[PDB]
C-alpha cells in the first residue's frame, strides 16, 4: 500500500574524455526500466512499463531524457573545470529521483544527488540546495545551476506533476505483478562454528514473493531466541532468498524444526524437522 518509485542514475567520469551514465528504474523492488549508456533509447523491463502514458507522451519524455543524458555529461565536465584544481577525476555521481505514493490522492517527490558516494545536493521547492554536511565549494556549482531558470521549471514539472501522474498509472497497469504471490521452498544444512565444540544450523528459504517473511527455529511450541536471520538476497527470477542460523551444541540437534511463515502459503506454515 506504500510503493516508492526510484529513477537511479549512475555517472562515472574517468578523465576529461571518458564518461558513462547508466540508470535503472524501480517500483518498490520490481525493475521497470533500464537505460544503458550503450543504448540510444530507454528499455522497458515489464510489459506495463509505460503505465497509462500514450506513445506521443512517452516518445516526448524519452526525447527530453536523451537530451538530458548528453547535457548532463557536458555539464559535469565543465563544473570540474570551474572548480579544479580543488576537485578532480575520477568522479562518481549518483542520482535518485522519484516519488512515494500514499493511499490518498497523496505523494511526495525527491531528487537527491551524491558525489563520490556522499549525499550532497537535493532539488527542493524551486532550486537546488546543499544538504547538512555538504562542503562549501559546492556553492558555486549550485549558484550556477540555479541561474538556469528553464531547467528548474522543467524539474519542478517532473517532480510535482509528471512523476506522480506517471506512477499512479503504473500502479494500476502493474497490479498482479506487484500483488503476485510466490511460495517459498525451504531446506536445511549444517556447518562447524569457529568455537571448538559447536555446530551452526542453517535454514535456507528461497523463491518467495513479496519480501515480508518470518523464519524461526522451533523446538515444539518454543521459539529459539538465538535465531540470527540473514540479509534478504535477490534471485534472478525476481524472488527473494534468506536464511536463518542457530548455534547449537553438538548432539542437541534433536527434534528441532525450522518454521516459515509467508503470505503465499495461505497460513499453512512450512515446518521442516531435522
Amino acid at each position: 500500500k506504500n510503493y516508492t518509485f526510484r529513477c537511479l542514475q549512475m555517472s562515472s567520469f574517468a578523465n576529461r574524455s571518458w564518461s558513462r551514465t547508466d540508470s535503472v528504474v524501480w517500483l518498490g523492488d520490481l525493475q521497470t526500466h533500464r537505460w544503458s549508456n550503450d543504448s540510444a533509447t530507454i528499455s522497458f523491463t515489464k510489459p506495463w512499463s509505460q503505465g497509462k502514458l500514450s506513445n506521443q507522451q512517452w516518445e516526448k519524455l524519452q526525447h527530453m531524457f536523451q537530451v538530458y543524458r548528453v547535457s548532463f555529461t557536458r555539464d559535469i565536465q565543465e563544473l570540474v573545470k570551474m572548480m579544479s584544481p580543488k576537485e578532480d577525476y575520477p568522479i562518481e555521481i549518483q542520482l535518485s529521483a522519484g516519488c512515494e505514493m500514499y493511499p490518498g490522492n497523496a505523494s511526495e517527490s525527491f531528487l537527491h544527488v551524491a558525489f563520490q558516494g556522499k549525499y550532497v545536493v537535493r532539488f527542493w521547492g524551486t532550486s537546488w540546495q546543499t544538504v547538512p554536511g555538504a562542503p562549501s565549494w559546492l556553492d558555486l556549482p549550485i549558484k550556477v545551476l540555479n541561474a538556469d531558470q528553464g531547467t528548474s521549471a522543467t524539474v519542478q514539472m517532473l517532480l510535482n506533476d509528471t512523476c506522480p501522474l506517471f506512477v499512479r498509472g503504473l500502479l494500476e497497469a502493474g497490479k498482479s505483478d506487484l500483488e503476485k504471490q510466490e511460495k517459498p521452498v525451504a531446506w536445511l544444512s549444517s556447518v562447524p562454528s569457529s568455537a571448538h565444540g559447536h555446530r551452526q544450523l542453517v535454514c535456507h528459504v528461497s523463491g518467495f514473493y513479496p519480501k515480508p517473511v518470518w523464519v524461526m527455529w522451533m523446538r515444539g511450541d518454543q521459539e529459539q531466541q538465538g535465531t540470527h536471520r540473514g540479509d534478504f538476497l535477490p534471485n534472478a527470477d525476481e524472488t527473494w532468498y534468506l536464511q536463518a542460523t542457530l548455534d547449537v551444541e553438538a548432539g542437541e540437534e534433536a527434534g528441532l524444526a525450522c518454521r516459515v511463515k509467508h503470505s503465499s502459503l495461505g497460513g499453512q506454515d512450512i515446518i521442516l524437522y531435522w
Binding site: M10, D22, V24, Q31, R34, Q94, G117, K118, P234
Partner: peptide, 15 residues
C-alpha cells in the same frame, strides 16, 4: 549479470 544498482545508502550491488 543484472544491471548495476545502488541502495538508499548509495552503495552499489549487482547479481
Amino acid at each position: 549479470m543484472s544491471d548495476m544498482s545502488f541502495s538508499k545508502d548509495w552503495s552499489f550491488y549487482i547479481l
